[PDB]
Automatic annotation (TrEMBL), chain B:
Residues 5-148 form the 6-phosphogluconate dehydrogenase NADP-binding domain. This is Dehydrogenase. It comes from the Bacteria. Pfam families: NAD_binding_2, RedAm-like_C.
Length: 285, 286
């Protein structure tokens, strides 16, 4: 099926490359035409203008720096985009994606927002994941196409969901990485490398990952059992982590922030509340 | 051979240790400062000794599990004479320094000493996959491997007795972090009526992808060479700011993203735009 890709930066080039290696007829457009050279070699058709590109296909994928750019670029092509399917894999906020979808509704444009959770060299590779939201009709119908980039997880019809889920997952990434590097910092004061530390974390993360189904259940039922010792002892642990961190000779930022946060849930509840009770603390802005 | 073991201290964790010993056929002698705690284990065939000294003399390996190293020291100091010649395994939780203190005392009296740290709850003693960190006497570890393997999965870390506690705390840091952040995400998604149980599969998958980033981050962390093409510190700081702001927009707290934003952005403010996330380690060191 004939498909168009607007934006040929590192990620947009990767999205088109994968459509092409599966033998889709791939029309492309980029502001800097130079970047479509390798792709047009392997057999893409480069439009002269964006309008031109849009007219070439019933599916349009867009991947550019941000939604202000997307807006500036698609707004003029609203008339040309009527009746076509639009898949926006630009990264931005829930609100921007919702606005896009609104915009797309009034101009009779089927609209699927997505957020890519891998690097360009990871497109078409196993373990690539794209979160998707907006038009279900666009998702099924183009599911084959989407699956060339990775596992496509359709989340629902609110086009904001992809961005929202993404940012929640990114939160876990940033958190996990900082805590890794704090662990490596600390064991470093004892001549253990990050790479000798690494296998233990790999093992330990498996155990942690087994903990979360129970944490999730409780967070939802609101019944906070004490399967990790209860807040009292985990708060004391964090404190001891912070104190031992200083003692060995590094900073205490990571433990400090976590201490403050778990400690707070100790106030609004009991000593024998599980960690799961911490959701309740975050819900109150 | 299922040789005779003593357990001193029979709170929930100490009692769980003793029960696994009994359940692998070890003749188990127990002591607690209050006798009735030993009720269920004596019905299961533990021998409850009259005193700590009697307990210590029954067995050639002594396991102690009490609330802290202060109580441990108050208990074991008088038994120095009695413990001399025997193996002592200390699964009390505490600091690296407390464990190094206990090791140095133990060496003074010729007490072979292994310090450990249990990384599960009582309920998970005797389950494989429950993790134990052991540090101290290589002799005791290999000589009583079969014993330690009753309680779960033994990770022997080296000769320094404080290592078990050091790693425990580092790894616990990672569990606290992942739980904090996962519930932050759960609460964020709850503003659109998505439950934590719906979110969980998406996290469990992403966790796999996150684990696969660490080898590379580990390598950079060790080398000092933070320059990246993927995981640009600058764009990640903006990612974090974006997450904080979407958080108050959807109408929850921001304490988790904000605390991280601060830390990463502090490194961006004194490193290089070119840096990758591994560079954080330089900032945590100061
Ligand atoms: N790369 C990654 O690892 C990831 C990327 N993303 C998202 O993918 C999107 C694109 O990223 P990436 O390809 O790496 O970035 P690049 O900077 O490599 O490319 C950005 C694209 O935007 C275009 N563009 C920029 N400004 C304008 C403008 N004013 N008018 C029209 N087009 C414009 C560029 O055209 P030109 O070449 O002429 O500048 C280029 O095609 C972003 O939303 C990013 O967050 C999502 C997940 C991770
Ligand atoms: N349980 C958990 O979730 C986890 C536990 N740990 C660590 O394991 C350790 C063992 O905890 P656990 O034994 O189950 O806890 P408890 O506090 O329930 O029991 C403490 C033990 O020490 C004795 N004791 C307490 N205070 C004194 C005192 N002042 N003088 C003399 N003896 C005293 C108690 O006797 P009595 O029964 O008479 O009070 C009991 O034998 C802790 O340090 C904990 O941090 C590690 C991982 C997780
Ligand atoms: Na210990």
């Amino acid at each position: 099926e004939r498909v168009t890709v607007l934006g040929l930066g590192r990620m947009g080039a990767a999205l088109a490359g994968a459509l092409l290696a599966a033998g889709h007829p791939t029309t492309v457009w980029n502001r800097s035409a130079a970047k479509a050279g390798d792709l047009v070699a392997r057999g893409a058709v480069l439009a002269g203008t964006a309008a031109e590109a849009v007219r070439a296909s019933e599916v349009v994928v867009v991947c550019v720096t941000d939604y202000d750019v997307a807006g500036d670029l698609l707004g003029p092509l609203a008339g040309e985009l009527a009746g076509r399917a639009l898949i926006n894999l630009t990264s931005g906020s829930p609100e921007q994606a919702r606005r896009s979808a609104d915009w797309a509704a009034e101009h009779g444009i089927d609209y699927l927002d997505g957020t890519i959770m891998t690097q360009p060299q990871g497109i078409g590779q196993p373990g690539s994941v794209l979160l998707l939201s907006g038009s279900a009709e666009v998702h099924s119908g183009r599911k084959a196409l989407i699956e060339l980039w990775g596992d496509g997880d359709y989340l629902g019809a609110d086009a904001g969901l992809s961005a929202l889920y993404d940012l929640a997952l990114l939160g876990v990434m940033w958190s996990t990485i900082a805590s890794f590097l704090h662990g490596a910092a600390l064991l470093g004061t004892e001549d253990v490398t990050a790479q000798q530390f690494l296998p233990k974390v790999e093992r330990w993360l498996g155990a942690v990952a087994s903990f979360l189904p129970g944490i999730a259940a409780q967070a939802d039922s609101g019944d906070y059992a004490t399967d990790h010792g209860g807040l009292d002892i985990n708060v004391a642990g964090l404190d001891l982590l912070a104190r031992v961190s200083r003692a060995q000779g590094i900073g205490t930022d990571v433990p400090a922030a976590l201490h403050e946060l778990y400690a707070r849930r100790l106030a609004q509840g009991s000593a024998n509340d599980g960690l799961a009770s911490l959701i309740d603390t975050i819900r109150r802005g």
